[model samples]
Target: GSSGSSGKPAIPSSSVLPSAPRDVVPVLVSSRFVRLSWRPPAEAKGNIQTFTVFFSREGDNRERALNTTQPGSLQLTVGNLKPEAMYTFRVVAYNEWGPGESSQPIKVATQPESGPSSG
Candidate 1:
């Protein structure tokens, strides 16, 4: 038994895309691999459909991209890195409407060779 419209009918309707992610940073890492973390969109218009990651490596190692949709995972991993090489990552959020802007770029080290066949 509820049929009232007190002047301000339920708001928040027709959600569009969303804004870029925030606080994109590195969590843990090891030689040849690094873990990336980021926050959801600043202005999410709809449910977080999926998360996409883009990255590029120095010395023409080729760029790569991947997707993440698990709710328990706000972080991802990047592997197969070379020592002394520079790498950067960007994250994007998507919804039913479309994809939002990409997060800020993050550059980190892949560390040097550990104790495995010294140079």
Candidate 2:
């Protein structure tokens, strides 16, 4: 009899530069912050050493509009946004060689400013 199971969690593509991010979950989006989290794209041939997150309200730019996570962190949160703005985000999984494909996430709209209603 042949039987098999799986690991603890779910599973990406294969590439030297590294696969584009997938199943990206927008953790939380508020009037001033954007939190995003994701796993490896699929299967990366090379050793993925670094990752980054980028966003924009209009077109696009460079590092100023992005943030490089620490070593191998996949969860990145950007704050101090221009409330009520449409932000476009992208994530990249870089392999040993260098930079790789970037996963362009769907636009995320920031929540409106709300007054605190605490007791």
Which candidate's TM-score is highest? Answer: 1
- Per-residue CA lDDT of model 1 for 7-116, tens digit only, reads 43553343566777776888876678878876666577767767888777865544788886567677878777776667877788767666655567778767776646
Model 2, residue 55: C-alpha shift (Å): 1.0
Give candidate 2 misplaced runs (Cα > 4 Å).
1-15, 59-65, 70-72, 114-119
lDDT of 2 by residue, 2-119 (tens): 2225333322323455767775767888778888888865677667766767677745433345656766568888887767678777687767665566575657888877635453
TM of each candidate vs. truth: 0.71, 0.68
